From a paper:
Subsequent studies in C. elegans, Xenopus, Zebrafish, and Drosophila confirmed the role of UNC-45 as a myosin-specific chaperone, promoting the folding of the myosin ATPase domain as well as coordinating the assembly of thick filaments during muscle development. To better understand its myosin folding function, we established an orthogonal protein folding assay in insect cells, characterizing the interplay of the C. elegans muscle myosin MHC-B with its cognate chaperone UNC-45. Structural data of various functional mutants clarify the role of the distinct UNC-45 domains in this process providing important mechanistic insight into its myosin folding activity.
To this end, we used the motor domain of C. elegans body wall muscle myosin MHC-B as model system and co-expressed it with different C. elegans chaperones in insect cells. Finally, we crystallized MHC-B and determined the structure of the ADP-bound state to a resolution of 1.9 Å. The motor domain adopts the canonical myosin ATPase fold being comprised of the N-terminal, the central (upper and lower 50 kDa region) and a C-terminal domain, with all residues (except loops 198–210 and 633–650) being well-defined by electron density. Indeed, the nucleotide binding site of MHC-B is virtually identical to that of the human beta cardiac myosin, with the sidechains that coordinate ADP present in almost identical position. Upon elevating the actin concentration, we observed a 6-fold increase of its basal ATPase activity, which inclined from 0.043 ATP s−1 in the absence of actin to a Vmax of 0.257 ATP s−1. Using similar stopped-flow experiments, we carried out a broad kinetic characterization of the MHC-B myosin motor, determining the rate constants of ATP and ADP binding to myosin and the actin:myosin complex, respectively. In conclusion, the kinetic data demonstrate that the MHC-B variant produced in insect cells is a fully functional myosin motor, which exhibits similar kinetic properties to other muscle myosins. In contrast to the human protein, which has to be produced in a special mouse cell line requiring time- and resource-demanding procedures, the biochemical and structural analysis of MHC-B was performed with a recombinant protein that can be produced in large amounts in insect cells (15 mg myosin per liter cell culture) and is easily accessible to genetic manipulations. Considering the high yields and the overall similarity to mammalian muscle myosins, including the human beta-cardiac variant, the recombinant MHC-B should represent a valuable model system to address the assembly, function and regulation of muscle myosins in basic and in medical research.
Author numbering: 1 to 197, 211 to 404, 406 to 632, 651 to 790
The structure:
Amino acid sequence: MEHEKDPGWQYLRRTREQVLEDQSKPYDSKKNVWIPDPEEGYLAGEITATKGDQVTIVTARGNEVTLKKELVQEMNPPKFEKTEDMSNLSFLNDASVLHNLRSRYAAMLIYTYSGLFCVVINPYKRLPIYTDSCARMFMGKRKTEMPPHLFAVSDEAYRNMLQDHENQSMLITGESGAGKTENTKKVICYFAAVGASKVTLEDQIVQTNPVLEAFGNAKTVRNNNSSRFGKFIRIHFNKHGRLASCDIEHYLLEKSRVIRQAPGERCYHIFYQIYSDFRPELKKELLLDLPIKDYWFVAQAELIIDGIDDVEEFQLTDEAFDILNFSAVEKQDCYRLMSAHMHMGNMKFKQRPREEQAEPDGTDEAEKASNMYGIGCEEFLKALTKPRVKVTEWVSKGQNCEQVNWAVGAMAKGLYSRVFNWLVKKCNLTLDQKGIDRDYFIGVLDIAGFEIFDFNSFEQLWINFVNEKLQQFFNHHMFVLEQEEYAREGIQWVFIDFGLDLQACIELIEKPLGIISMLDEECIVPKATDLTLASKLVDQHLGKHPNFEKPKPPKGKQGEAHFAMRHYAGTVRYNCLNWLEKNKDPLNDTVVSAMKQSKGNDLLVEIWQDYTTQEEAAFMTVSMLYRESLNNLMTMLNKTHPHFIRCIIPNEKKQSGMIDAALVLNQLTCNGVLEGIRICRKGFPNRTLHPDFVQRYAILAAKEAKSDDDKKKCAEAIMSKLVNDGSLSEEMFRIGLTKVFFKAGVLAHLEDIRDEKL
Ligand SMILES: Nc1ncnc2c1ncn2[C@@H]1O[C@H](COP(=O)(O)OP(=O)(O)O)[C@@H](O)[C@H]1O
């Protein structure tokens, strides 16, 4: 044809010869089954005997086991090998979902539908499925008429927007390394392609990527180019489909990374880009006269990334600034602040014997940082070692070396955070051009899933709270669609909103004197500590809220913990150490004041404009800003039609084609996929329009099938015969106004009788 000529088609759908070979395997619906297996998650076997509540099974490895029947899962026939939408399987169970995804992944078919979910398993290699010619194949095509692909989901959202006159959202989730960033970039490019009719808006949208990834992405153990911030990117269009504008919102930037690197990790890419040989004189202008290995804040672990050329990356970043209309002075002032950060991390201090007051231990690095900030080194060091506190008089407050080091790290994190916020805001101004009406938008949300670590803190609480909200959002969306379908089919049975399954945990976190409220209140109580917070939380909730628990003893390498919560993804042990400090984000106000007075670095003055000093003043916690931000995100998502992309990391080795079955099953458990298949299975997983049912099953009831001119009455007549024959129960189906609805396993049984009689 023409589809089959494109190189991407072999990575989208098997040939007829590969399919017939897939379907050419021995199979007995009553013999071949799946059993639990520690290594492989599930293992194929054959029932050789059955005895009451038990079954004897020879597994694929040859051994013989005896199991309770409740552990045995039905295996799908080979005609369902590599099925494109798993809600079509005859048997909707965990073992079959795992098998189908693994079979597709082995053939580098990385996209699979699962009803409302689009699952994508990271290929860890280049696939030719994202080219212009591949994208054009999906434009205007019915999603059900094309193989699974990110572009089919994207094009359906775009057509929905135009035909339904409603905003859309694309929610992309998954663990670190699963593929979120890559999918997000390709979605944005697809929308910029379909919405495009001497520097175009589309060009500038794309150029945000090098800038935002230089300052917001870093090498981690899990991912060489890990985005350390969540993001919501809205692509605005007029009512004719024309690209109009784009805006970006960022969430939870990882601030600790600019002062600390764990083994195997790097700081944000930008420091190594600036230092690279792309612009050799830049190091000299920035007074970066030591090897990069000697700058403590960026050199605690790795300095290079296998496969990444920081020279070429910096060229792309430096050019992107220009394309995005940053001025030469803005760009240089930005680079100077990055230099200042590296110099600050190398400043040393000491105390003389029996002195509590820190003094500089040499001043060369402080002078270089001050030069980058455009301020005097003496006032900078005085602000740092002897800050002033208003109490109606300015008093000087002494600092020891521990306090100075704390203050330097806090300043460096808060200054970097504000540079990043400024880069986003500047991008947003560039991308907001005159010309095209902003009638609708599609919002792309890319943020990490649940995080359950050995040690869970304030940052994990917020990301897990976010994901409770997002999973409830999915559950509610699924519930509304089911309810609306039954309603218009005249089959309404009354069921409770699936989103209520997450509401108790959400309330524990978000209600008055729930977790966040108690933190906000305690953070301002004189003499309060992390321990008084924790006792208050236990006092308010333990034994009164079922999702609040005392934590298990530190098994394995779990740290100490003050309380535990039962999240959607499991039980999380939280440690409240430093939560009061994290919630207030205190800075050295005297240092900020000196920076806001700088005459040598206008960008430095700009990025502190959101901060009010003591002198300017003469309360908003972090969680209050986060709560407002999340509430605004959710209010907006609930005024859109959402689409769901679930990225899966296949293994821990960045190995293409290899599946770690335990790791994959765990993600499918925690990301809603397996629970969605269960909920599907327990309802009416299958629906067939009356005419197609009549043609499908006439042979089982040929007189009934032709008994009436009205196709609905013919379908009813067939079903009445099956119920009369005993080969169907009235409970197993429902006749709708336009479709027949089938409980789990009922359609397959009807296929069995149809094939037998055939
Ligand atoms: N669809 C894909 N095609 C090619 N490579 C991919 C794809 N998805 C992920 N990768 C690879 O895996 C790495 C991690 O993916 P990424 O999207 O950065 O994960 P996440 O953003 O979820 O942390 C990428 O840098 C890239 O090498």
